[PDB]
Design an enzyme around this catalytic site. Structure first.
Site, mmCIF file in Angstrom:
data_model
loop_
_atom_site.group_PDB
_atom_site.id
_atom_site.type_symbol
_atom_site.label_atom_id
_atom_site.label_comp_id
_atom_site.label_asym_id
_atom_site.label_seq_id
_atom_site.Cartn_x
_atom_site.Cartn_y
_atom_site.Cartn_z
ATOM 1 N N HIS A 212 48.655 38.491 28.836
ATOM 2 C CA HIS A 212 49.535 38.956 27.791
ATOM 3 C C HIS A 212 49.715 40.452 27.984
ATOM 4 O O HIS A 212 48.943 41.090 28.680
ATOM 5 C CB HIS A 212 49.004 38.672 26.351
ATOM 6 C CG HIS A 212 47.707 39.403 26.096
ATOM 7 N ND1 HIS A 212 46.518 39.029 26.687
ATOM 8 C CD2 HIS A 212 47.409 40.502 25.338
ATOM 9 C CE1 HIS A 212 45.562 39.898 26.362
ATOM 10 N NE2 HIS A 212 46.079 40.801 25.515
ATOM 11 N N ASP A 214 49.905 43.740 25.204
ATOM 12 C CA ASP A 214 49.542 44.027 23.816
ATOM 13 C C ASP A 214 50.783 44.287 22.952
ATOM 14 O O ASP A 214 51.760 44.932 23.369
ATOM 15 C CB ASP A 214 48.597 45.174 23.696
ATOM 16 C CG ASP A 214 47.199 44.883 24.130
ATOM 17 O OD1 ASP A 214 46.935 43.745 24.501
ATOM 18 O OD2 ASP A 214 46.368 45.831 24.081
ATOM 19 N N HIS A 268 47.039 41.780 31.013
ATOM 20 C CA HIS A 268 45.599 41.615 31.112
ATOM 21 C C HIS A 268 45.204 40.316 30.446
ATOM 22 O O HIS A 268 45.983 39.646 29.755
ATOM 23 C CB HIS A 268 44.844 42.807 30.528
ATOM 24 C CG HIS A 268 45.199 43.140 29.130
ATOM 25 N ND1 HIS A 268 46.399 43.674 28.737
ATOM 26 C CD2 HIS A 268 44.553 42.832 27.984
ATOM 27 C CE1 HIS A 268 46.427 43.793 27.421
ATOM 28 N NE2 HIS A 268 45.315 43.272 26.913
#
Ligand SMILES: [Fe+3]
Length: 329
Positions: A212, A214, A268
């Site tokens: 994903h 953030d 990440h």
């Protein structure tokens, strides 16, 4: 074997002071980190993280199933229709290992104008009984303000790194209105650990949370000393080493948008590890009506072909999208 990601340790203490040349040298470090893997550790941050970890453990290990229902967000408890963001996020033994508690700006009180107006993404925090968790609410509200202060200093560094005056982001990051959140996440040790709470990446890595970007301007994260995060680079996914004395910082997709992807929001993911540990993010979110005009520090005239996006629109839609992509946490 997996290679180690380059995650430099940056002494951010000059960002709290008035030495402008020293702040520029920090800003350069932030710039370099942000153009490379997208992650750095903030050191010399002034926050008592040992105490944060101890108080969070005392909470996680003493809250009861009864209290978790009573504090549960709407996704777990239909009676709590106002709790979209703030409250308890329950585990499901045999299926879902993670659990967490999220809270928002302590200034979102019943009399706050955005609570009165019922504006999305604003909620009044819910807390456990003071007698069952003595000191917890007070500790957690003070931690919000401690990590808010650190985040304001880091935003001065990002602004300087991008060629702006130091209050370019921080002027939009204000105690009376910030949508920033704290999440106190418990990743438990389990024996046996249910396979249903383990996801598998395409490259075969066992994960607790999938890839994903953030939903944040930046993310200011404390974690226990158990290695778990991986960052995608041009050389593949690389391991981010743990540092339980520092804060791990990265940009979210609002920063990517504002900078026309000069500071990318790094992709990440969280590896599965069968270890009792903590992950305590502070998502640096602006106010609901905050709008930063996008720009491009790679173009001579700084102009970008992106449209301004209000932060509240970004955040409400980003949080729904992340749940749709990677599951309700
Ligand atoms: Fe993340």
């Amino acid at each position: 074997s997996v290679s180690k990601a380059n995650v430099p340790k940056i002494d951010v203490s000059p960002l709290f002071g008035d030495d402008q040349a020293a702040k520029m040298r920090v800003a350069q470090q932030i710039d370099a980190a942000s153009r490379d893997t997208g992650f750095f550790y903030a050191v010399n941050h002034g926050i008592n993280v040992q105490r944060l970890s101890q108080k969070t453990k005392e909470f996680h290990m003493s809250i009861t199933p009864e209290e978790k229902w009573d504090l549960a967000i709407r996704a777990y408890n239909k009676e709590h229709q106002d709790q979209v963001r703030a409250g308890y996020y329950l585990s499901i033994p045999g299926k879902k290992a993670v659990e967490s508690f999220c809270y928002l700006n302590p200034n979102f009180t019943p009399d706050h104008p955005r609570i009165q107006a019922k504006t999305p993404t604003h909620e009044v925090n819910v807390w456990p009984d003071e007698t069952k968790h003595p000191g917890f609410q007070d500790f957690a509200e003070q931690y919000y303000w401690d990590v808010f202060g650190l985040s304001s200093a880091l935003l001065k560094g990002y602004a300087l790194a991008l060629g702006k005056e130091e209050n370019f982001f921080a002027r939009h990051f204000k105690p009376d209105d910030t949508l920033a959140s704290v999440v106190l996440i418990r990743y438990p040790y389990l024996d046996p650990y249910p396979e249903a709470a383990i996801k598998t990446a395409a490259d075969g890595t066992k994960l607790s949370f999938e890839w994903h970007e953030d939903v944040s301007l930046i993310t200011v994260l404390y974690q226990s000393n158990v290695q778990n995060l991986q960052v995608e680079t041009a050389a593949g996914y690389q391991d981010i080493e743990a540092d339980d004395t520092g804060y791990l910082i990265n940009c979210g997709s609002y920063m990517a948008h504002l900078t026309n992807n000069y500071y990318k929001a790094p992709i990440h993911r969280v590896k599965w590890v069968n270890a009792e540990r903590q992950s305590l993010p502070f998502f640096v979110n602006l106010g609901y009506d905050s709008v930063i005009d996008p720009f491009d520090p790679r173009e001579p005239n700084g102009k970008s072909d992106r449209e301004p996006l209000s932060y509240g629109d970004y955040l409400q839609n980003g949080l729904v999208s992340l749940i749709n992509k990677n599951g309700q946490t």
